[PDB]
Design a protein around this ligand. Structure first.
Ligand SMILES: *[C@@H]1O[C@H](CO)[C@@H](O[C@@H]2O[C@H](CO)[C@@H](O[C@@H]3O[C@H](CO[C@@H]4O[C@H](CO)[C@@H](O[C@H]5O[C@H](CO)[C@@H](O)[C@H](O)[C@@H]5O)[C@H](O)[C@@H]4O)[C@@H](O)[C@H](O[C@H]4O[C@H](CO)[C@@H](O)[C@H](O)[C@@H]4O)[C@@H]3O)[C@H](O)[C@H]2NC(C)=O)[C@H](O)[C@H]1NC(C)=O
Ligand SMILES: *[C@@H]1O[C@H](CO)[C@@H](O[C@@H]2O[C@H](CO)[C@@H](O[C@@H]3O[C@H](CO)[C@@H](O)[C@H](O)[C@@H]3O)[C@H](O)[C@H]2NC(C)=O)[C@H](O)[C@H]1NC(C)=O
Ligand SMILES: *[C@@H]1O[C@H](CO)[C@@H](O[C@@H]2O[C@H](CO)[C@@H](O[C@@H]3O[C@H](CO)[C@@H](O)[C@H](O)[C@@H]3O)[C@H](O)[C@H]2NC(C)=O)[C@H](O)[C@H]1NC(C)=O
Ligand SMILES: *[C@@H]1O[C@H](CO)[C@@H](O[C@@H]2O[C@H](CO)[C@@H](O)[C@H](O)[C@H]2NC(C)=O)[C@H](O)[C@H]1NC(C)=O
Ligand SMILES: *[C@@H]1O[C@H](CO)[C@@H](O[C@@H]2O[C@H](CO)[C@@H](O)[C@H](O)[C@H]2NC(C)=O)[C@H](O)[C@H]1NC(C)=O
Ligand SMILES: *[C@@H]1O[C@H](CO)[C@@H](O[C@@H]2O[C@H](CO)[C@@H](O)[C@H](O)[C@H]2NC(C)=O)[C@H](O)[C@H]1NC(C)=O
Ligand SMILES: *[C@@H]1O[C@H](CO)[C@@H](O[C@@H]2O[C@H](CO)[C@@H](O)[C@H](O)[C@H]2NC(C)=O)[C@H](O)[C@H]1NC(C)=O
Ligand code: NAG
Ligand code: NAG
Ligand code: CA
Ligand code: CA
Ligand code: CA
Ligand code: CA
Ligand code: CA
Ligand code: CA
Ligand code: CA
Ligand code: MG
Lengths: 737, 49, 465
């Protein structure tokens, strides 16, 4: 979630050269300079008589971002005789697979055709050029004397390669033994020491190679993709190979022993022609020191909303256990015809949280079918099924789909800030992009508030300017930050404090700060990483007890913090990111002390009654009608209590009776909102317990329709309380005479 | 004896159409007639090579 | 008593007839002035009007030819000609019928695997082609049939690129002659010449590549998308018989040969009848194949040998709407599949109206196979051969034009036959043919007298001038 996308670094190669088909890092042991290795399998080289012979470039990161080819092989086609070329380097696709250990570079040419030593043929045996800094050797493991289609003639060795930590080379040829596939493992030392330019079929010792099988395994393409990881007791790395056409084109993944090339486990797809094994990876995603297998099936079809299959692709995550058990889960694609599981690139601990992450790329997804790379972060339980980052290609297709995300590399820190980076190679536009992870800053925010219950009567506080001596309370807020890797010591933080949250709908504000005299107060903080609390004391004072609309809704405290994002690295302005799953805002609650029993809520009992005192009115006159209403709350406090007298279309309100002391002078109003006219009268806020109100309302009635026979009123008390907030509706009838 | 024929599994002749030698690559499978225990060459396969 | 006629049509014949379908006119001078002249026919008889002086033309539908709809030229709309008579502001209803008896149109394309693995199944493939043509000509008369071919992508490692004498003949290593390899070769466009189809199918021969999977999905996709090249008819039922005896190359398999460009989707067959992008574009995925087949309305049928029946049945389960047959000495399985495909051929009847005038208006009641009259609908789906449907049509006219004659055609879309009308608006009394020019009969005034009544000119507002 922290990969920088605003300003990545792009590398452009020769047009139509498939630059960026295979990407990798360069980590020289004898130098401190870090380079990017990028393959250009269709580029043009200076070799004599070789056209589109492919090349491998090394591109700097901080030196003009220029790309210079590596001179693995500066010669042309060797001659077996007077006029008899021995090898054919034209259109050999050199650079289709680039791997790099500390000082070693293994660039392979899958389509290199070599005329046999027996008959004039053209067989894509494939060659690999191993480079150890100074001594560049040629490693063709399946250029042997058993040359035919039945053997390693169409080996295409170097289609998929990998490096084990014990200085061993894993090589995969999907064409050996009638396209059954092969895995060849030779030690780097043996390869370098056994090189001899005058002999083409060199036999290495300590060679682990898979053998031929029955004819029912043909066209399985074993070695289409190879990964390396440890999957048994010993510390020797085992070989994981994708076999995408195995088991009647279902797909499979073979795991072989890293000591003597013996099969250990097997994975199988569920859908035909889904290409299960196109890309495989072996990384520890839950951080219990046990490698986990990730298998990509970019052509997987799953049922949609209407039950029709849609090609979205799938990635299967198999979590290793203490025994041979694997807890396999499926990660379905997101867009149809996107090839989700095309390339799987373990990023290592991208955000430095403890568990390694992973990036799976759909190279034909997104808008304009440019390309999408998803990023899934590993957790203790396993792999998060929701991507935490989306990377979009930004180069439109010219003649071929850009294929952004067809091949990526990860788990190598190139700017030395402590976070692994990612190279994404889009060869449809001949581009390579380097995404550098931003530092992750976690924040442990805190918001300590004074006791939630606020007493309105308790007014032992001072005020500026007027000294009204009203109630006040204090709010304490503070936060710490700490992140791994390179990070500036002092991080600028600004915190905004909002008073009476979840109520900003044009209403009034009740709680208000003592000094700023505003519901909002912002302050700047320069906190130090890994430090203790840095808490400032703020004082807020409530308004008048009879000023705000209601005292029921709790007062909410809101504190939102945002990183300055100007604490960027001096290298390329890499601004640190905040942790993705932590909230960026803290909300606390406050209550206004109100005697409401032990349940902490006021539950009133509202009663209303009325007598006629006239019991009859004459039709033709405007008769003065006075209704004696008794409004009593025998329950607890009733907040914002008013009685509702919904008079009919006939009469209208005149005024409250004030000529007698037995009745009250209730403040009353005439309302007409929402299709109904009615009379409201304030009953007290709040309306205390056991309070019995008695008052009279004068009216004036003049009949509408000559056959009406009655005048019916409706009386009801309602309050803004949450439970038992309304009185039973009482209907009073006056008979026309 | 039963001669352990490629199509004469056990001793009885197998059904006509059984494959005795699966074809590797774009080639023609070798079938057995069901009256001879051997694996006969496919008639129209080449120059009877 | 008073009615609409007595307040609107009391002027003369034309407006009395234009008021209402039931309005009637009296042309008898024995009727005293004051009595209504435009009223009910019964009311007119009650006023003692002469029946010969009663001008009450009733709208009626007069069918002219009513030969019944044929069964299995052919007749497919009955009646085929109606003489329709409307007075102004009137509606008349008649019933038509559409019985689909004509045969369904059908398009069959034949994809032949011509690899060296098919040198034994060549006779089976040609026999299936001839039997398919014969069977579909027997089932339906409107049939167009063609065919094509495929081997694989002509690139290494699929192809034989050495020795250079094996580029023109891949069977050099076997010491035999076989034709050069190709991706997809469209041979015969969709034609009704079964003799030509049989000749060109029997004139085929095999090629040779290296690996067992073939590029048949590329051929399927090209035959699907190259509408103009293949000859797919817009209004027809398309069937695509795909033949193979080995496994099939799926998408992402071309990365071995160096092809990393996904199948774009367009048609790439050129003027040489060859798949031009065979060596630059990958094999098509099952999802894309499904999408294109559904878009183009094509019924893929797998006619594969016994050893890949299960493999292609599972592929068909992944491709909805696809059936798989067995290729053998007899073509009974694939022929039954073809017959069933013809059996689930469902026709629809979309009624259309041409040169419809502005004045006339129509109302449709579709009485489909459920026999439920559905107002507002005029197109019943699901019709079969020998199946009969009807439609209730009521024609309403607003007023009357001066054309005095019009004709419009009713026709089902995709149907040769049609119903034609001859709408003749009455718009007037018959007695106005014997009208008097001016004055004379109508007293000393100089108005006009017609049909037993007089209507003066400007100024003279009297009943009889
Ligand atoms: C993950 O999945 C992988 C793929 O399924 C598994 O790999 C497969 O494991 C199988 C064992 O589980 C293994 O089968 C064994 O194959 C060898 C091959 O040696 C043969 O040598 C013969 C003489 O050269 C030739 O074939 C003869 O035999 C076959 C019948 O098998 C006949 O049809 C032929 O005409 C010919 O006479 C071949 O050249 C071939 O190289 C066999 O020797 C083994 O025989 C043993 O088991 C059988 C019972 O099945 C016994 O009767 C016999 O006495 C032996 O004890 C097996 O058949 C597959 O070859 C192998 N395939 C690949 C590509 O790896 C993998 O095991 C799995 N892992 C896990 C952990 O499950
Ligand atoms: C690497 O250098 C080679 C040098 O040969 C480039 O190959 C050449 O590419 C041009 C196109 O830029 C080809 O021209 C073409 O000629 C054909 C007729 O032969 C014509 O139909 C086309 O429209 C186009 O004009 C040229 O033939 C070809 N040379 C060959 C094949 O020997 C290659 O493009 C360069 N690659 C990169 C990635 O720069
Ligand atoms: C009436 O309101 C005033 C506010 O102006 C209350 O005074 C504050 O009350 C809080 C608790 O409600 C107390 O804070 C305490 O401060 C000590 C340090 O002196 C600290 O060790 C405690 O943990 C606690 O935070 C304190 O009494 C006082 N604080 C300040 C800054 O004025 C008063 O308590 C209210 N009275 C009633 C009866 O509600
Ligand atoms: C290759 O190595 C594996 C393990 O490293 C060997 O498998 C073990 O063989 C011994 C002796 O036969 C058994 O006692 C163990 O139970 C085996 N471990 C298993 C099956 O997990 C294997 O024998 C070696 N040689 C080969 C495969 O040829
Ligand atoms: C306050 O924080 C919340 C979450 O801590 C955010 O608001 C939304 O919260 C829901 C549920 O947690 C999330 O699904 C949404 O994604 C959040 N919105 C956004 C834009 O991320 C948000 O950070 C803050 N919201 C407010 C109103 O301050
Ligand atoms: C086609 O699909 C069927 C099942 O839909 C496959 O038959 C299964 O084969 C596996 C082989 O491991 C068995 O374990 C199952 O028991 C079989 N199921 C049934 C119902 O038979 C069949 O193998 C598939 N064909 C191909 C060529 O893969
Ligand atoms: C289509 O069907 C509807 C209903 O079956 C017909 O409406 C009826 O028409 C008759 C004749 O005018 C009336 O007597 C009924 O009262 C109508 N019923 C309803 C429910 O409206 C309609 O006339 C038919 N239209 C045609 C063109 O046949
Ligand atoms: C806090 O910092 C922001 C930007 O750094 C500034 O605009 C604002 O005035 C500052 N406020 C205070 C109180 O320092
Ligand atoms: C027109 O509809 C009426 C129903 O109101 C029906 O009786 C009559 O038969 C219909 N006309 C014809 C020609 O069937
Ligand atoms: Ca191991
Ligand atoms: Ca693990
Ligand atoms: Ca992480
Ligand atoms: Ca970094
Ligand atoms: Ca209470
Ligand atoms: Ca065959
Ligand atoms: Ca092939
Ligand atoms: Mg074949």
């Amino acid at each position: 979630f922290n990969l920088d996308v605003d300003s990545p670094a792009e590398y452009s190669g020769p047009e139509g050269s498939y630059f960026g088909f295979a990407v990798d890092f360069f980590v020289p042991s004898a130098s401190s300079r870090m380079f990017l290795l990028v393959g250009a399998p269709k580029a043009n080289t200076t070799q004599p008589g070789i056209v589109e012979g492919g090349q491998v470039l090394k591109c700097d990161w901080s030196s003009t971002r220029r790309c210079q080819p590596i001179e693995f092989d500066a010669t042309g086609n060797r001659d077996y005789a007077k006029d008899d070329p021995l090898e054919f380097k034209s259109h050999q696709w050199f650079g289709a697979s680039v791997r790099s250990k500390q000082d070693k570079i293994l660039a392979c040419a899958p389509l290199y055709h070599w005329r046999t030593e027996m008959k004039q043929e053209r067989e894509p045996v494939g060659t690999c050029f191993l480079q150890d800094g100074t001594k560049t050797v040629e490693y063709a493991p399946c250029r042997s004397q058993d040359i035919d289609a039945d053997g390693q003639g169409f080996c295409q060795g170097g289609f998929s390669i990998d490096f084990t930590k014990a200085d061993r080379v894993l090589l995969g040829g999907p064409g050996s033994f009638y396209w059954q596939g092969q895995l060849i493992s030779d030690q780097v030392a043996e390869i370098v020491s056994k090189y001899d330019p005058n002999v083409y079929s060199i036999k290495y010792n300590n060679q682990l190679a898979t053998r031929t099988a029955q004819a029912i395994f043909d066209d399985s393409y074993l070695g289409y993709s190879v990964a390396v990881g440890d999957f048994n007791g010993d510390g020797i790395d085992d070989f994981v190979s994708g076999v995408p056409r195995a088991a009647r084109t279902l797909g499979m993944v073979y795991i072989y022993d890293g000591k003597n090339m013996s099969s250990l486990y097997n994975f199988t797809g569920e859908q035909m022609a889904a290409y299960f094994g196109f890309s495989v990876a072996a990384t520890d995603i839950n951080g219990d020191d046990y490698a986990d297998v990730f298998i990509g099936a970019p052509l997987f079809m799953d049922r949609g909303s209407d039950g029709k299959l849609q090609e979205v692709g799938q990635v299967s995550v198999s979590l290793q256990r203490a025994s041979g058990d694997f807890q396999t889960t499926k990660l379905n694609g997101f867009e149809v015809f996107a090839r989700f599981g095309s390339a799987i690139a373990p990023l290592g601990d991208l955000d430095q949280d403890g568990f390694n992450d992973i990036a799976i790329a759909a190279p034909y997804g997104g808008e304009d079918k440019k390309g999408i790379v998803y990023i899934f972060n590993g957790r203790s339980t396993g792999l998060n099924a929701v991507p935490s980052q989306i990377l979009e290609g930004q180069w439109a297709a010219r003649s071929m789909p850009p294929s952004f995300g067809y091949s990526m590399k990860g788990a190598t820190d190139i700017d030395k800030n402590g976070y692994p980076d990612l190279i994404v190679g889009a060869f449809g536009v001949d581009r390579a992009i380097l995404y550098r992870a931003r530092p992750v800053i976690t924040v442990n925010a805190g918001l300590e508030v004074y006791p939630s219950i606020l007493n309105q009567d308790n007014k032992t506080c001072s005020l500026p300017g007027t000294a009204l001596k009203v109630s006040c309370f204090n709010v304490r807020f503070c936060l710490k930050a700490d992140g791994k890797g390179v990070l500036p010591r002092k991080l600028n933080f600004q915190v905004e404090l909002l008073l009476d949250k979840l109520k900003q709908k044009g209403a009034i504000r009740r709680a208000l700060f003592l000094y700023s005299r505003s519901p909002s107060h912002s302050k700047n903080m320069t906190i130090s990483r890994g430090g203790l609390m840095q808490c400032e004391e703020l004082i807020a004072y409530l308004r008048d007890e009879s000023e705000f609309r209601d005292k029921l809704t709790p007062i909410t405290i809101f504190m939102e913090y945002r990183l300055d994002y100007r604490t960027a690295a001096d290298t390329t302005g890499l601004q640190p990111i905040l942790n993705q799953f932590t909230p960026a805002n803290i909300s606390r609650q406050a209550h206004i002390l109100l005697d409401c029993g032990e349940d902490n809520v006021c539950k009133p009992k509202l009663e209303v009654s009325v007598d006629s005192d006239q019991k009859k009115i004459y039709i033709g006159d405007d008769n003065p009608l006075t209704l004696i209403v008794k409004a009593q709350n025998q329950g607890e406090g009733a907040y914002e209590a008013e009685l509702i007298v919904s008079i009919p279309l006939q009469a209208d309100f005149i005024g409250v009776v004030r000529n007698n002391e037995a009745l009250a002078r209730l403040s009353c109003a005439f309302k007409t909102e929402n299709q109904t006219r009615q009379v409201v009268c304030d009953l007290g806020n709040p309306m205390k317990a056991g309070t019995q109100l008695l008052a009279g309302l004068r009216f004036s009635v003049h009949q509408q329709s000559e056959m009406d026979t009655s005048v019916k009123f409706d009386l009801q008390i309602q309050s803004s309380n949450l439970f038992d907030k309304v009185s039973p509706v009482v209907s009073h009838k006056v008979d026309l005479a | 004896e039963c001669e352990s024929g490629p199509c004469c599994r056990n001793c009885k002749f197998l059904k006509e159409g059984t494959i005795c030698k699966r074809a590797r690559g774009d080639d023609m499978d070798d079938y057995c007639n069901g009256k001879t225990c051997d694996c006969p060459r496919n008639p129209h396969k080449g120059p009877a090579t | 008593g008073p009615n609409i006629c007595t307040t609107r049509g009391v002027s003369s014949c034309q407006q009395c007839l234009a008021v209402s379908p039931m309005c009637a006119w009296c042309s008898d001078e024995a009727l005293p002035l004051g009595s209504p002249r435009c009223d009910l026919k019964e009311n007119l008889l009650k006023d003692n009007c002469a029946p010969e002086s009663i001008e009450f033309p009733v709208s009626e539908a007069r069918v002219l030819e009513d030969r019944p709809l044929s069964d299995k030229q052919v007749t497919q709309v009955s009646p085929q000609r109606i003489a329709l008579r409307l007075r102004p502001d009137d509606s008349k209803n008649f019933s038509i019928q559409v019985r689909q008896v004509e045969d369904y149109p059908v398009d069959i394309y034949y994809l032949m695997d011509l690899s060296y693995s098919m040198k034994d199944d060549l006779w089976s493939i040609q026999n299936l082609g001839t039997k398919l043509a014969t069977q579909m000509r027997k089932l339906t008369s409107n049939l167009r049939i063609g065919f094509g071919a495929f081997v694989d992508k002509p690139v290494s490692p699929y192809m034989y690129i050495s020795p250079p004498e094996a580029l023109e003949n891949p069977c050099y290593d076997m010491k035999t002659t076989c034709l050069p390899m190709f991706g997809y070769k469209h041979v015969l466009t969709l034609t009704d010449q079964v003799t030509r189809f049989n000749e060109e199918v029997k004139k085929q021969s095999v090629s040779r590549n290296r690996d067992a999977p073939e590029g048949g999905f590329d051929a399927i996709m090209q035959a699907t998308v190259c509408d103009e090249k293949i000859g797919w008819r817009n209004d027809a039922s398309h069937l695509l018989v795909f033949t193979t005896d080995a496994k099939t190359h799926i998408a992402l398999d071309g990365r071995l040969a160096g092809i990393v460009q996904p199948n774009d989707g367009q048609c790439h067959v050129g003027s040489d009848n060859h798949y031009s992008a065979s060596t630059t574009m990958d094999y098509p995925s099952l999802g894309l194949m499904t999408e294109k087949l559904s878009q183009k309305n094509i019924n893929l049928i797998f006619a594969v040998t016994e050893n890949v029946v299960n493999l292609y049945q599972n592929y068909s389960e992944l491709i909805p709407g696809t059936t798989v047959g067995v290729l053998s000495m007899d073509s009974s399985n694939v022929l039954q599949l073809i017959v069933d495909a013809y059996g689930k051929i469902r026709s629809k009847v979309e009624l259309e109206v041409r040169d419809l005038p502005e004045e006339l208006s129509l109302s449709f009641n579709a009485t489909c196979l459920n026999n439920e009259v559905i107002p507002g609908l005029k197109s019943c789906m699901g019709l079969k051969i020998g199946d009969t449907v009807s439609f209730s049509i009521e024609a309403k006219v607003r007023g009357c034009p001066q054309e005095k004659e019009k004709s419009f055609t009713i026709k089902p879309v995709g149907f040769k036959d049609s119903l034609i009308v001859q709408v003749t608006f009455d718009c007037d009394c018959a007695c106005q043919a014997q009208a008097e020019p001016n004055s004379h009969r109508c007293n000393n005034g100089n108005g006009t007298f017609e049909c037993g009544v007089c209507r003066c000119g400007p100024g003279w507002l009297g009943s009889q001038c």
